[PDB]
RNA sequence: GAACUGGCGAUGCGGGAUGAACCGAACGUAGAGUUAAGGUGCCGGAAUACACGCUCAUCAGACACCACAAAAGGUGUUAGU
RNA sequence: UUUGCUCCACACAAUAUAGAUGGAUACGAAUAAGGCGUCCUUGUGGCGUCGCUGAACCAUAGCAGGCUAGCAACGGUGCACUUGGCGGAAAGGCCUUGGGUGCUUGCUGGCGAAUUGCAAUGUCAUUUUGCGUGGGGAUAAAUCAUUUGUAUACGACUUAGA
């Protein structure tokens, strides 16, 4: 489900005769589609308040597009996840051009490094790092140096045919 | 001219099949120079001839023909499905067939 | 972590010429020539100013950048061996039987011959590697000197001589007899 | 597309080359593989030698002459890999296997024919740099192949003769290229360049 | 007496490096490297060729030997101005790589009649070339 | 040895190599199309697809039922508090 | 042994094809490097250029390809002859000297084709042979039976016999 979009989901408890106009709670949810986004909304509202989908209503769901989707950003993400033997809190840094793409990278990386499935991940917070010297992971820091430039040694060229006649090279 | 060919070379690969059951009514053909279904779309409906030789002369000739035609593409790599008037004899798995340019839409 | 770029710096003294094509390094100093094949390491050599050679690993992991420092040490040892050379000193340790060490000729090859080790009637022969010179130092009792341009070959000949004089079927921490490397330095004294 | 395709096995990974050749032969293409002793297997030499020893212990208990046979030559190791990728017990599999020849070195007449490569099976393109790999000739010698030295000597002889061929070929192609360039910028050359030639 | 080290130079991923996109929506248009995301990702912009400003994998492009001065993270108008100032398109078109692409496309665009002229013209040039080889 | 339900027995078919019971799906005789479960290096029909990472094992690992593995350890390497 | 055997030529008959339909088009080595060209105070040398696929190169027009005269030039390409070499990993192929002869679409010239009826592989290849024709060449053995015992259940083995 990593064709990720971000939605704002606003919902509430159902109005009653004694309590009209409830407090209109809102969440930011990364999900593949609106159905999953509303599911995640009710999942988190059930887990933090005494409101289930039966006693409430979704007032609004809107897709939030990245404000500047074409500038490279440094993102700090806070997650809590479940391992095989406990729950843990984690902080990670992702360099990428949008929030949804950072979160996609986050899910792929948590699956790769911790075998943490989507079920097992709560994204606590995704925030742009305003400036350098606040980045704390070296794998992001090393890309922020001055006049960065590196080669890509050992280029492997795709061959459309079964046999080549030339014993190819890896120069680049 | 040293060449007189007016057909495209093809190879009869196998029958349509699952892992353990084949269907001889459909033949899988690899057309030389075709690598994508998009390219193989050109050849749908083209007549196919399998040409083979016999000792006995039948009707003024010792070389016999099995006719068929390309029906649809198969997979992602340019293989096409073909149906023949009589099914190909399965000893021809790996034999050469001729895909003609008629009927022509170009 | 796959560091983007890691480099090490190699200093080249004035009398030394290093030629590196592909990964075949040759170093030519006043005392002679050394040649090393590094084709198994996958690094990049780049000369800066005829006295400085950079060596780099691009997008390399932990063990690959450990091997980069290893390459730096190997080339440094080549240069130090063609400038000063390597000298290894061995002392003879014995409690009762004096160890008799001689240079001998069997057939076209020099052999370090060891006799009377723990009173043994066996005669131990250690081949001398090419480039390694053998001397028996005077004014110090029972010291043999290994000298050469390659620290690898000198130290391996030293280790061969030390390993061939291991004690068997005895408590070695009591029967301490042997030929042990006592000094690891250069040929020129400074 | 050629009637016979001659594959230089040097630098290829044995299993990927076997899969490619098996599909070629099953689709009715004739393949000659030369320099089987220069094939490559991923993994360290000791690992692949342990694997071959584990192969070596498997034999029919009550009669070893009917058990699995343990061929030591590099060409027969590659042929063994090709079996298992061809259903050799059928008539169609026997025909596909009869479409195949494997050699150590490059014997005649293939020594004067062009050799091709299979880039999807090339180690230099497929293996990650820094990964250990095994050479089939040395593995075969270690498990009992007898003819590594004679093959190396005879391949050196073929390589010197081929180098003389190539020096002559360089002279001729330089002559042809210089004379073609001289005849360039003529009316026919201009028109052919306009047409894309 | 002089130390010699074979450099083994590469094309470099840096801001301002000209890339040729080889597959995707553009598929054969030049773009400029605007900023480096990570080891496999960059931001490119191709305003002259109409390539949208986008973040792309380095496996989707192939670096060219062309390079021009460009500040990090430059916007699309700035890239356009610097591209025009450096005359990147002409420097590309002067390369044998670009003429190879143009020449394969021209061959693909030939008609059957044009192929017939190609055959006759090649025979004539071959006749003259063979005379030159005989004299040589 | 009991409970509820679904099955096998009484049932072929596609998949799990193989198998009463699992997954999918239940069956007149055919044609065409699309799929299920399962797959797409080769055997073997179908991408040696694309993408992000992790792992090198001188007993690697490789799919549910299912054809086992533990307590306890490692400056191996990778993320993190 | 119905005047046997064998090898070149040759027309005939069969034959049966794991599958021809322009060309299998020759360095080696490396890939965190190379190819090619050029120059020199010959190197692990300088300089330039190339790759990013064979999407190439060669070939390729003519009744499945018929009939002909020249022009610059002595080219291109078959067929037999021939000169010398080279190749033993399974060489059985590669290169070259000279003349003869056919074609040449390099260019400009001259005639024909139809009715296979609107397509039908529309037969052009490659094997193995048997019967004839006309030239060349060669002119045995093995087994049974008998015999030996270095062998042996029988076969087999090992010996001998004009």
UniProtKB/Swiss-Prot annotation, chain B:
GO molecular function annotations of the record: structural constituent of ribosome
Linked residues for Glycyl lysine isopeptide (Lys-Gly) (interchain with G-Cter in ubiquitin): 46
Keywords of the record: Acetylation, Cytoplasm, Isopeptide bond, Ribonucleoprotein, Ribosomal protein, Ubl conjugation
Entry comment on modification after translation: N-terminally acetylated by acetyltransferase NatA.
GO-annotated cellular components: cytosol; cytosolic large ribosomal subunit
One Pfam match: Ribosomal_L35Ae
Localisation per UniProt entry: Cytoplasm
Residues modified to N-acetylalanine: 1
Assembly and interaction partners: Component of the large ribosomal subunit (LSU). Mature yeast ribosomes consist of a small (40S) and a large (60S) subunit. The 40S small subunit contains 1 molecule of ribosomal RNA (18S rRNA) and 33 different proteins (encoded by 57 genes). The large 60S subunit contains 3 rRNA molecules (25S, 5.8S and 5S rRNA) and 46 different proteins (encoded by 81 genes).
Purpose: Component of the ribosome, a large ribonucleoprotein complex responsible for the synthesis of proteins in the cell. The small ribosomal subunit (SSU) binds messenger RNAs (mRNAs) and translates the encoded message by selecting cognate aminoacyl-transfer RNA (tRNA) molecules. The large subunit (LSU) contains the ribosomal catalytic site termed the peptidyl transferase center (PTC), which catalyzes the formation of peptide bonds, thereby polymerizing the amino acids delivered by tRNAs into a polypeptide chain.
Family per similarity comment: Belongs to the eukaryotic ribosomal protein eL33 family.
Note: There are 2 genes for eL33 in yeast.
Gene giving rise to this polypeptide: RPL33A
UniProtKB/Swiss-Prot annotation, chain C:
InterPro entries attached to this UniProt entry: Ribosomal_uL6-like, Ribosomal_uL6-like_a/b-dom_sf, Ribosomal_uL6_a/b-dom, Ribosomal_uL6_CS2
SUPFAM superfamilies: Ribosomal protein L6
Organism from which the protein derives: Saccharomyces cerevisiae (strain ATCC 204508 / S288c) (Baker's yeast)
Subunit structure, as described in the record: Component of the large ribosomal subunit (LSU). Mature yeast ribosomes consist of a small (40S) and a large (60S) subunit. The 40S small subunit contains 1 molecule of ribosomal RNA (18S rRNA) and 33 different proteins (encoded by 57 genes). The large 60S subunit contains 3 rRNA molecules (25S, 5.8S and 5S rRNA) and 46 different proteins (encoded by 81 genes). uL6 lines the binding pocket for eukaryotic elongation factor 2 (eEF2).
Listed GO MF terms: rRNA binding; structural constituent of ribosome
Misc. comment: Present with 52400 molecules/cell in log phase SD medium.
BP terms from Gene Ontology: cytoplasmic translation
Name of the protein described by the UniProt record: Large ribosomal subunit protein uL6A
Subcellular location: Cytoplasm
GO CC annotations on file: cytosol; cytosolic large ribosomal subunit
Signal peptide positions (record): none
Protein family according to the UniProt entry: Belongs to the universal ribosomal protein uL6 family.
Main location: cytoplasm
Tree of life domain: Eukaryota
Pfam families with a match to the protein in the record: Ribosomal_L6
PROSITE patterns given in the database record: RIBOSOMAL_L6_2
Keywords: Cytoplasm, Ribonucleoprotein, Ribosomal protein
UniProtKB/Swiss-Prot annotation, chain D:
Gene3D superfamilies assigned: 1.20.5.4280, Ribosomal protein L13 (3.90.1180.10)
GO biological process: cytoplasmic translation; maturation of LSU-rRNA; negative regulation of translation
Gene Ontology MF annotations: mRNA binding; RNA binding; structural constituent of ribosome
Chief location category: cytoplasm
Glycyl lysine isopeptide (Lys-Gly) (interchain with G-Cter in ubiquitin) crosslink residues: 175
SUPFAM superfamilies named among the record's database cross-references: Ribosomal protein L13
Localisation per UniProt entry: Cytoplasm
Record keywords, A-Z: Acetylation, Cytoplasm, Isopeptide bond, Ribonucleoprotein, Ribosomal protein, Ubl conjugation
A Pfam cross-reference name: Ribosomal_L13
Reported modifications of this chain: N-terminally acetylated by acetyltransferase NatA.
Further information: Present with 43300 molecules/cell in log phase SD medium. There are 2 genes for uL13 in yeast.
Family from the record: Belongs to the universal ribosomal protein uL13 family.
Record's protein name: Large ribosomal subunit protein uL13A
Protein source organism: Saccharomyces cerevisiae (strain ATCC 204508 / S288c) (Baker's yeast)
Gene encoding the protein: RPL16A
UniProtKB/Swiss-Prot annotation, chain E:
Record-linked CDD domains: eL14
Annotated GO biological process: cytoplasmic translation; macroautophagy; maturation of LSU-rRNA; ribosomal large subunit assembly; ribosomal large subunit biogenesis
Subcellular location: Cytoplasm
SUPFAM superfamilies tied to this protein: Translation proteins SH3-like domain
Pfam (any one): Ribosomal_L14e
Keyword Ribosomal protein: yes
Example of a GO MF term: structural constituent of ribosome
Subunit and partners: Component of the large ribosomal subunit (LSU). Mature yeast ribosomes consist of a small (40S) and a large (60S) subunit. The 40S small subunit contains 1 molecule of ribosomal RNA (18S rRNA) and 33 different proteins (encoded by 57 genes). The large 60S subunit contains 3 rRNA molecules (25S, 5.8S and 5S rRNA) and 46 different proteins (encoded by 81 genes).
The protein's name in its UniProt record: Large ribosomal subunit protein eL14A
Lineage: Eukaryota, Fungi, Dikarya, Ascomycota, Saccharomycotina
Protein encoded by which gene: RPL14A
């Amino acid at each position: 489900m990593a064709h990720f979009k971000e939605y704002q989901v606003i919902g509430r408890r159902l109005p009653t005769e004694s309590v009209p106009e409830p407090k209109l709670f809102r969440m930011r949810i990364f999900a593949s589609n609106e159905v999953i986004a509303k599911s995640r909304y009710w999942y988190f509202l059930q887990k933090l308040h005494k409101v289930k989908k039966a006693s409430g209503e979704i007032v609004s769901i809107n897709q939030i597009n990245e404000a500047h989707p074409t500038k490279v950003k440094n993102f700090g993400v806070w997650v809590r996840y479940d391992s095989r033997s406990g729950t843990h809190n984690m902080y990670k840094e992702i360099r990428d051009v949008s929030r949804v793409a950072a979160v996609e990278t986050l899910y792929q990386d948590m699956a790769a490094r911790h075998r943490a499935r989507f079920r097992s991940i709560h994204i606590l917070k995704v925030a742009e790092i305003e400036k350098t010297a606040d980045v704390k992971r070296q794998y992001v820091k090393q890309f922020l140096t001055k006049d960065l430039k590196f080669p890509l040694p050992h280029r492997v060229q795709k061959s459309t045919k079964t046999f080549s006649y030339k014993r190819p090279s890896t120069f680049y | 001219a040293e060449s007189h060919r007016l057909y495209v070379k093809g190879k009869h690969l196998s029958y349509q099949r699952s892992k353990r059951v084949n269907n001889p009514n459909v033949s899988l053909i690899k057309i030389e120079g075709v690598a994508t279904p998009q390219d193989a779309q050109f050849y749908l409906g083209k007549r196919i001839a399998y040409v083979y030789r016999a000792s006995k002369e039948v009707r003024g000739s010792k070389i016999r023909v099995m006719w068929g035609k390309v029906t649809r593409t198969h997979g992602n790599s340019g293989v096409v499905r073909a149906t023949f008037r009589n099914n190909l004899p399965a000893k021809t798995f790996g034999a050469s067939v001729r895909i003609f340019l008629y009927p022509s839409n170009i | 972590m796959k560091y983007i770029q890691t480099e090490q710096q190699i200093e080249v003294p004035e009398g030394v010429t290093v030629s590196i094509k592909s990964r075949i390094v040759k170093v030519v100093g006043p005392r002679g020539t050394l040649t090393k094949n590094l084709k198994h390491i996958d690094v990049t050599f780049t000369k800066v100013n005829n006295q400085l050679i950079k060596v780099a690993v691009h997008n390399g992991g932990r063990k690959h950048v450990a091997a980069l420092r290893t390459v730096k040490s190997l080339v440094d040892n080549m240069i130090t061996g063609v400038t000063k050379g390597y000298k290894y000193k061995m002392r003879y340790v014995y409690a009762h039987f004096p160890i008799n060490v001689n240079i001998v000729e069997k057939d076209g090859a020099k052999f370090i011959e060891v006799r009377n080790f723990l009173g043994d009637k066996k005669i131990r022969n250690v081949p001398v590697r090419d480039g390694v010179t053998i001397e028996f130092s005077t004014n110090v009792k029972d010291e043999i000197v290994l000298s050469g341009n390659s620290v690898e070959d000198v130290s391996q000949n030293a280790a061969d001589l030390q390993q061939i004089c291991r004690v068997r079927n005895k408590d070695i921490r009591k029967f301490l007899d042997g030929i042990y490397v006592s000094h690891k330095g250069f040929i020129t004294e400074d | 597309v050629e009637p016979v395709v001659v594959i230089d096995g040097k630098g290829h990974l044995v299993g990927r080359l076997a899969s490619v050749v098996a599909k070629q032969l099953l689709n009715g293409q004739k393949i000659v593989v030369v320099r089987a002793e220069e094939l490559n297997i991923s993994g360290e030499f000791f690992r692949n030698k342990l694997k071959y020893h584990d192969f070596l212990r498997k034999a029919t208990a009550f009669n070893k002459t009917r058990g699995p046979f343990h061929f030591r030559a590099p060409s027969r190791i590659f042929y063994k890999a090709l079996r298992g990728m061809v259903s050799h017990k059928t008539a169609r599999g026997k025909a596909a296997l009869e479409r195949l020849k494997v050699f150590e070195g490059i014997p005649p007449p293939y020594d004067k024919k062009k050799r091709v490569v299979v880039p999807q099976a090339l180690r230099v393109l497929r293996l990650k740099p820094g990964r250990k790999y095994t050479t089939l000739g040395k593995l075969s010698t270690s498990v009992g192949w007898k003819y590594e030295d004679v093959v190396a000597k005879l391949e050196a002889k073929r390589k010197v003769s081929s180098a003389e061929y190539y020096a002559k070929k360089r002279a001729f192609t330089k002559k042809v290229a210089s004379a073609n360039a001289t005849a360039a910028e003529s009316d026919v050359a201009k028109q052919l360049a306009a047409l894309g030639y | 007496t002089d130390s010699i080290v074979k450099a083994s130079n590469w094309r470099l991923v840096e801001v301002g490096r000209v890339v040729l996109i080889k597959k995707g929506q553009s598929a054969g248009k030049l773009a400029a490297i605007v900023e480096i995301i990570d080891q496999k990702k960059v931001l490119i912009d191709g305003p002259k060729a109409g390539v949208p400003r986008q973040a792309i994998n380095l496996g989707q492009v192939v670096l060219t030997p062309l390079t021009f001065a460009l500040p990090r993270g430059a916007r699309t108008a700035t890239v356009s101005k610097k591209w025009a100032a450096a005359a990147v398109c002409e420097k590309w078109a002067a390369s044998s790589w670009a003429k190879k692409i143009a020449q394969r496309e021209r061959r693909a665009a030939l008609t059957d009649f044009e192929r017939f002229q190609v055959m006759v013209l090649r025979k004539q040039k071959r006749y003259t070339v063979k005379k030159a080889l005989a004299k040589a």
